[PDB]
Each structure stands twice: as C-alpha cells, then as structure tokens.
TrEMBL record, chains B, C:
Protein name: Putative transcriptional regulator (LysR family)
Ligand binding (Mg(2+) 2): 103
Keywords tagged on the record: DNA-binding, Metal-binding, Transcription, Transcription regulation
Residues engaged in binding Mg(2+) 1: 43
Pfam families recorded: HTH_1 (PF00126), LysR_substrate (PF03466)
InterPro entries assigned to the protein according to its UniProt record, in alphabetical order: LysR_HTH_N, LysR_subst-bd, WH-like_DNA-bd_sf, WH_DNA-bd_sf
Positions contributing to Mg(2+) 3 binding: 164, 264
SS bonds (residue pairs): 150-157
Organism from which the protein derives: Acinetobacter baylyi (strain ATCC 33305 / BD413 / ADP1)
Record family assignment: Belongs to the LysR transcriptional regulatory family.
Taxonomy of the source species: Bacteria, Pseudomonadati, Pseudomonadota, Gammaproteobacteria, Moraxellales
Keyword presence, Transcription regulation: yes
Gene3D superfamilies: 3.40.190.290, Winged helix-like DNA-binding domain superfamily/Winged helix DNA-binding domain
Automatic annotation (TrEMBL), chain D:
Provenance organism: Acinetobacter baylyi (strain ATCC 33305 / BD413 / ADP1)
Annotated S-S bridges: 150-157
Protein name: Putative transcriptional regulator (LysR family)
InterPro entries: LysR_HTH_N, LysR_subst-bd, WH-like_DNA-bd_sf, WH_DNA-bd_sf
GO molecular function: DNA-binding transcription factor activity; metal ion binding; transcription cis-regulatory region binding
Binding site for Mg(2+) 1: 43
Record carries keyword Nucleotide-binding: no
Residues binding Mg(2+) 2, per UniProt: 103
HTH lysR-type domain residues: 3-60
CDD domains linked: PBP2_CysL_like
Family: Belongs to the LysR transcriptional regulatory family.
Amino acid sequence: MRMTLRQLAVFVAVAQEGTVTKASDAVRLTQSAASMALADLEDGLGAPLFDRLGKRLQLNDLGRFLLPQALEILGRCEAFEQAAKGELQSIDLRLGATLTISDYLIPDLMADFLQIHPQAHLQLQVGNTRQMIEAVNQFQLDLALIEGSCHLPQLQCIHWRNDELAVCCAPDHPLAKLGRPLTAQDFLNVEWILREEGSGTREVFDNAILQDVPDANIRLTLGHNEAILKIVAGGLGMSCISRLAIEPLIEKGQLVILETPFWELTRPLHLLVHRQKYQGPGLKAFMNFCENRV
Amino acid sequence: MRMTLRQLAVFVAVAQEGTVTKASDAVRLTQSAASMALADLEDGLGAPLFDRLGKRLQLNDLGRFLLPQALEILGRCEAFEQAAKGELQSIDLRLGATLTISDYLIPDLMADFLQIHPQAHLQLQVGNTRQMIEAVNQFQLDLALIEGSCHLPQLQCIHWRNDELAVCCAPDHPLAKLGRPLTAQDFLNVEWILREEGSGTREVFDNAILQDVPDANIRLTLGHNEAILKIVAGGLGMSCISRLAIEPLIEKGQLVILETPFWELTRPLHLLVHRQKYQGPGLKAFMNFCENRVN
Amino acid sequence: MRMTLRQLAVFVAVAQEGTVTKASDAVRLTQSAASMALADLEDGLGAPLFDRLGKRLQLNDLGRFLLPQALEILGRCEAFEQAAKGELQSIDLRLGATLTISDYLIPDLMADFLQIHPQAHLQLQVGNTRQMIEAVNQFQLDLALIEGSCHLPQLQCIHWRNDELAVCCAPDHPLAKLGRPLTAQDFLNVEWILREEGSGTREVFDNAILQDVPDANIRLTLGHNEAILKIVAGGLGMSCISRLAIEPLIEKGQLVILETPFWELTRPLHLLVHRQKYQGPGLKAFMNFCENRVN
Amino acid sequence: MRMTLRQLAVFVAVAQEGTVTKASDAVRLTQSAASMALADLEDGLGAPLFDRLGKRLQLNDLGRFLLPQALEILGRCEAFEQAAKGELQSIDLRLGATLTISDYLIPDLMADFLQIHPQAHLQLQVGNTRQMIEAVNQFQLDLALIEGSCHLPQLQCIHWRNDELAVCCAPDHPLAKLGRPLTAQDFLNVEWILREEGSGTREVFDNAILQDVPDANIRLTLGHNEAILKIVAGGLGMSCISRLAIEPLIEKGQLVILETPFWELTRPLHLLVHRQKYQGPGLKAFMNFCENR
Ligand SMILES: [Mg+2]
Ligand SMILES: [Mg+2]
Ligand SMILES: [Mg+2]
Ligand SMILES: [Mg+2]
Ligand code: NA
Ligand code: NA
Ligand code: NA
C-alpha cells in the first residue's frame, strides 16, 4: 500500500474545487505540498486521475470511478475516529439550495443546525435547480435542497416537504373583490409577473396555468421573489409564487391570494444527493436534521 | 418578379396625380425614370394598372384592387424609417444585478420605474459580479448593476453610488463589551462569516481587513446575506456586510456595529455596459433613472 | 425614401443566417453587394442594426424592434406580386422538426407538399424541442413542428395532432408473457432504454412514468429512436416511444406493446411560429397543408 | 485525520499475530517503525487498544470494537488500489455520431456491442461533423464517429472505414431510362437536392461533383437523408448521398443509382478522440469493437 489518507483527501478536494490551489486551501496544505501529494497518488496508482483542461482539472474515466470509493474510505475513517472518542467530531459539508428555499428556509435551518453543532463547517451555494443538479452530479455539492423537478437517474431525490404556490395580486385588483367564485377564464387578460424560465417556480405556472391561458401576457420575468411581489403589490399584475414569500406580505396588507382551485399549485421540495456518495457522520446528521423538521 | 419601392411609389403617385409628369414631380424623379418604373411594374405584373387616354392615366379594376396594398407597403416603409430615425423602440431590457443590490435596492427601484413605464418589457437575472461581467461581455445583458471591481477595457464601468459596509456581531460578543475604542489587533482571532470568493462584499474584506489579519479564521463561507446575518446574530462570529442588510437587525437589537475607522469599508456600485453595444432609448431611460435615485 | 426592398431582405437574411456571407447566399447576392446593402441601410437609418461580436452579428435593441416590420414589408410585397399575377411567386420557408416528427412524418410531408407547389424552396432543420424553440425565437425558422411542450411567451403553438407513446419490449420479455394485466409495480427493476433528457419523448417518461418507479434503472440514454428500438428488441430492457416508430416492428414480430392503462402516454404535436412573424402567402400555404393533413 | 493507513495496518497485524515482532514482519516493517505507529494510534484515539502481558498483545475491549472497522477500511483501500492499478472501472461512454453513421450503422453497432458488454453505460449525441469536433475538443464526448474531415492537431483522427456515396434518382428519370454512358455534361441541367453545408455528405458534392457541373442548380438543401430521398423519388431531381441510405429504396423500386464513373465519391469515416484525454478500458473496448467490424 503506497497511497495515504492525506492523498485521498487531496484527490477529493481537487475533484470538489477544480484546481490544486483551491484544493490546497480546503485541506490546509501549501500549494506545492498538495501538488506533491496528488502527484504521489497518481504515480503510485500508475495512472492519472484528472484530465488537464489547460487550467482546470476534471475527473477522467478512472477518477470518476474511484472518487466514490475515496469518499467511502475517508468517511469510514471519520466514523472510526468518531466511534472511538464517542460522538460527532468534524462536520464539513458543501450545501446547495434553490432560490425560494434559500430565502425563506435556509437561514433558520443553518442557524438552528449550528446551535446544535457549533463546530460544523458549512458552505452554502445558491442557484437554480439545474445548477444544483449539475453540482451534485460533479460531486461539487454533498447535498442540495431543491424546489424544481428531479429526474436525473444517477442522483437520488429524497422528498423533503411540499410547497404551496398561490396566485397573488394587489388587494384592490378587480378579481379579488369579485362577487362569485373565479374561473380560469377570468384570468385571460391578466398581466403576469413571473419567475425566470427554467426555475422551479416558473415550472408550476407553465405546467398548471398556461394550459388555460395559452396567450397569457408575460412581459416581466424576474429572478427575484421580492421584486416580483413588490411590483404585483405596486398596482395591477399577478404572480404565481410560493406562500412562503406571499404570506409575510399578507400580514402587511400588501397582497391577497386568489382562490384558484381549478389549478394544482403543489410542488415537492427535495433533498438531492448522489447515489454513490457515502453518507459519513457529517452528511447523515444534517439530512436527519432536515427530515426531523416535521 | 423583382419589383421595387420606387415602382410602388410611381404607381401610387400616378394614381393620385393622373399623369406621369406630375407623378414624377411628386416622387422626385425624372419623367423618364418614373415612366420606366411604371412600365417595369406593369411588365412584372403582366397586366396594365391604368387605362391610357392621352396623357391622363386612370386606374383600371386591377389598379383599384392593388392600390390599397401599395399604399400600405409605402406607409409601413415610412413608419420603418421614422421608427429608426426617431429611435421609437419600446422598452425591452435584459438587466443584471448582484446579490446585495438585488436584495435591498432592486425591488423598489424596478417598482418605481414600472410606475412611470408600466408597459416596459424587463428581464432580471441575479448573480455574482464575475457572473455579471461575463454576461455583459457576451452581450447577454444590456445593463448590470454590480457591487464589485470592473477592470475591463471593453466594458464601461459607470459609477452609480457608494455602499457602506460594516463589521457586525451579536450584541454580547466579547469585542462588543470592551470599553476602550477598538483596534485592528483586537480582531486577530475573530471567527469570520463571509460571502464567497468572487463576490464584491468578500472583495471589501480581502482588500481592507486581511492586510491586518493575515491568517483570518474564515469560519464560514456562505453565498447568502441573510444566512450570514442569522448565524452572526445567533452568536457565531462576525461579518463584514452592507449596512443596508444590517440596519433592520440593529433596529431589532439582534446585531451591533463595531466601530472600525482603521478600515475603509466603503465600496463603489457601478452601472456596467458593453462599450460596443448599441444603447436604445429604453436603456438610456433606465440608466438615467438609476442615476437620479436618492441615496 | 433611400431604403430598398433589397436592403430589407439583407437585413432579414443576416438576422436569420448570422453572417453577411451566409445572408448573401440566401438572397443570391455577392458578398460585396450584401455588405454594402446593410451598411447603406444602417447609414440611412442613422444607427446600426446589429451588435458586432467579431464576425458574428446579433440583432441589437433597434434591430429586434424593426425586424418584425421588415418581415411584414417583404411579405406584403410577396402578396402584392401574387395578387396581380394570380399565382404564388415565391415560397421560401425555413422549417424545423423534432426527431420523431422528422423521422416518421416530415419525409412524406415535404415530398407531398412539393408535388403540390413544385416551385417551393424549403430548408429543413432538425433537432430537439429546445433547439426548435430557440431557432424559431431568433427568427431563424418560419415554422417548427415540435413534439415537446410549448412555454415561451413570444412564440405561439397551434395544436397540430396527437401522438401516442407506448411501453414496448421484445416479444419474449417476461412481462409480455404474463396473463394477468400489469401494474405499475411489475416495472420495478426494469432496465429502461430512453431518449435524451431534453427531448419531448423523455419528457413523457419523466412526468408520466417516473413517479411510480423512482429508482427506475436508466442505463442507456440515446438521442436516436431506432437505436433504442433495436437494443430493446435484441434482448431485455424496455422503452417508452412513439407508436409511429414501434408499429413497423410490432407487425414484424420484433417488439410488442405492454398495455399500461395506468399511465397517460398521449402527447400533443404542435406547429410553432413566432407571434411577431408576418405570415406571408408561402408560409400560410404550408401551415394550411399541415392542418389539412390530419383528417 | 491524524490516523494513517499505516497505523491501521499495524493495529490489524498485532491483532492477528499477537506480538509486535511477528506483526512487524507480516507488515514488512521494522520493529521500531511498527511500535511507533501503534503508539501514535492509541494517542490520537484517547485510549489503548491492547492489554499488555510482558509483550503479549491481545485486544482489549476497545480494540475488539474497532477492529472490524479497521479491517473494512484496509480492505477498501486494497480494493481501491487494485481497481486503480488494474483499471477495473466499468464502461461509461459518451458517444457522438454524424447523421449517415447514426441512421444506418449505429443501431446494429450499439446493439451488438451491448450483446458483448450488456452492463455498459452508453450515451449517444447525434450531430454533424463540426459539432462533434468541438464536442470532442471540449471533453463533452469520449469518442465521435464522423463522416467528415479532420483538421485539429490536438485531436487524434483514426480511419474507420470507407463510405461510397452515389448519385441517385427516380427510376423513370430521363437520364436513367437512357441507353448511353452518361457524361458529366448530361448532368449540367438537372435538379440537385443536397445536404446542408458544412457536413460530410456535402463535402463530396462540393469537392467531387461541383468541379464539372456549371449551372449546378442547387434546388434545395435539407439536413435529412431520408426526406431528400422520399422527395427525389417523388420525381423531383437527384442527390449525391451515401449508398447505405439509397439501397433500402432500391429493394422497393423507389430509386435507381446512376452510372457515374467520372466522379470518385469515396469518403472516409473516422474515429475521433482527444489526444490529452485518458482512455479507460471502456473506450478502448468500443474503439477496437468498431475497428473489428
Ligand atoms: Mg436574497
Ligand atoms: Mg467611510
Ligand atoms: Mg450618410
Ligand atoms: Mg390515452
Ligand atoms: Na474537478
Ligand atoms: Na463595482
Ligand atoms: Na454599421
């Protein structure tokens, strides 16, 4: 046996960060100490682990195959030291979250997780669903909390909770004061202010509300929940937004919700992990925590 | 067939004037060129558009049937030229904004802009300064409101306003309880909860504070302002973040600002456009609107 | 009026081809005549119509606003030329089509249309639904026949016809021998041979089947309908694919369809056009042929 | 981690041997080197892993609890090393192909490959030669089968096989019903239905046929081999297309290939890879499989 746990950690860090420089800071080694370690691993194994893309290092065919094995070896070693000293030692997680989850759930969730584990190391990256999927796919994230569809076969979609979107408008919109239940045909000429194409929130509108209003008027598309709601509340215009974002403004008399039972505005929120990623003590403790928010 | 606008103009002028000579004067042409134009049109259509009775030209049934088509074509060519010369475009902007700007300035700014121009088409993308520079450099955005450096010669970085950052901590942080004024040395072993490498907020910290705390304990790196403040108020460490984000928490007694006059925590905010990209009237209206915003 | 139909046609072709050289071939002008046509148009209008990305030309704010007007001016000229002669001068269509449509419907469609209008100029682009939507979005296509979902606001989708997909397998598959009708549970542990993630066929499996076998083994993902069907028939494994592609093999005895009434596998096919594109005589003639070809 | 695989190996050996001496030989290590390692391990855990009897070393309770964990870690490290040294990874390939290749060669090529390697993971992207070039240049693909021309030096181009394309027409076309050897001039006035520019099949009309036909009415341009042939059979014109595509129509009487010996019309099909991309056992398997057909 030539390889060392330090070398495996460098191999993992380079796969997570993309360069020896970024990887060296993540394992707390000088840059040439890290490059010596990676070179020793590759020379000992008799093959390179990364294709050299001029600048970035990207896992090659062998590196991809070996990466999950390295993560399991490192995770068991962490479990080893834990199982001796008798409790959760080091937590080091790279997390991702989509826009609505990060605005209205992540701050409380991470703060509460750090009250219980004051020593936990957590990185947070925010993006849309497909940016999260690709990050988990590249082993760049340990876990992502997503609000969009979940359909990649090598990734695992663990249902976390359901999120209710709603059609909202200004309190003085004519449809809010209508003396009869609403119909889909009442929204034919509404001006919609929606989330960007490709986001999970926009998915719901396109797959639930666009069917009935195929010529829906959509001039404003914003990748920001608050900007949408301030414009909707600033006069006419409607949006289909998570109740997580609307309800804080319903308290301030800025918005109302229209009853639209003819449209299914559910969506599932998911925890996204790689099916091959060994779940060491760190990750697993965080997943259960997220689940135990029953 | 290969007809021309000139031929349509002569066709219409003859329809309105009755003679080639007066038609040629209307459309600013020689009698020979106008006569030639009408003949080319009729030969292209393969049938006459006028009955010929001496020098006078009278529309025949075909002429009367095609005249409104010609008038519409000529009318829309004039609208085309006027719309271009007068730059009569509607507002149709693809905008970009960095995190702190998007969170605390974009909502009211865009809401107030849409009050004046409620029919404007706008798209907004949110990301990091580096992500915005690339978008603007690829001609994917008309304008970006960034909170970071911009050292690019092909891009034009216009100064918008200033953003004041501050060091904040939970009200009972040991450093918050000191009597004397603070010094940079007091911060050597602070646990820093910071924005990611590549953000402009992290640029302020790296530029000002790191010179005095070389091995600063970067306890956490989070790409979310509120997550940072929640964790700092919860009792873990400090952050260097915009006073726009801190203030509502100061008002609620969840964060305090530590005086650090030995550190310059002022940052410029910039309007970022591509020097080679045409600027329409909508972009110029939004840029002037941003410039005219209070501070 | 200094601008000409020739210049408008160049302006359109550049928007559709992306370079002057490719535009000059589309409008059958030399490179020089084409570049001079665009430059003079821009000079007269007092502003450029395209942003320059090197040799790439992409419409700028003013160009995007004026392009629909140019298309309408040229279409009305096509209509003028035909209304006087009685017959369709130019049919000149840039068409798009998704794979299943391109594999089993377009071939006999264009061949039959070209027998009715033997003078038409047709160009056929092929791709998945995301590309046809983008291609049409840029005005690079007059019309696309798509098999996926239609969600961009600036485009319009006319319901063309329906297409029924079906789970299929080799005749000797264990699930094809059972006597008791099948359940969603029988399909646990099946090896799936599916189309690529960004296709309308994979869209049906992802939203109509995947929610019942979430751990569904998806070992092979192929952007080719025939490759899938040959692999499925050559051993075990199944796919969910259009009956247009399966049924030649079902009647050959190389595949069978498993009845799956617990899954909705019907999906619409659409005609896709830009809402801002003027529908001239040629285009409107083709759209009518496709409508009058269902039943 | 302050613990090392070396420490684990020594912790296992003493458990299997019982004395530091024999445990040192079976790990191929000096006595001092091995005793130093066990000292560090018990240090960085907080407690000892053995009871001492002069120097008989039998597992105390802690050692018995952690030993099976040490054996599993060491076993996975050994498996990790044999997997790497022997390149025992599975097949996980991202493949590309041009249109004629995808339509007429890929279906039975991939199906037969999967009869040999049934658990292989394959992905297929279909697109013209220049998309595949860039895809392989961007590491978006492990291999591409291209019917076009190779240009780049940091790409490796490997001759796969030759492809003969021919000029095809409708059987009742006047030129076909003629009883005379055709000439390059008998084509001067005829309708040509070609594939898109910048494509493999296009190269052969623009490099071989466009040297002899002056008018050369490029009546159309379609990026679909079949649509071209359905049209050509409807009575409209001719095309210079791969014979792999034509012969299916010939068995049905819809197309006839014309005699045209004054035009070469041979074009090579190539395997395309990147010179700096590590080739695992899966890629070499598929590449050799292609070459042996
Ligand atoms: Mg935010
Ligand atoms: Mg100051
Ligand atoms: Mg001038
Ligand atoms: Mg049905
Ligand atoms: Na990497
Ligand atoms: Na700035
Ligand atoms: Na110009």
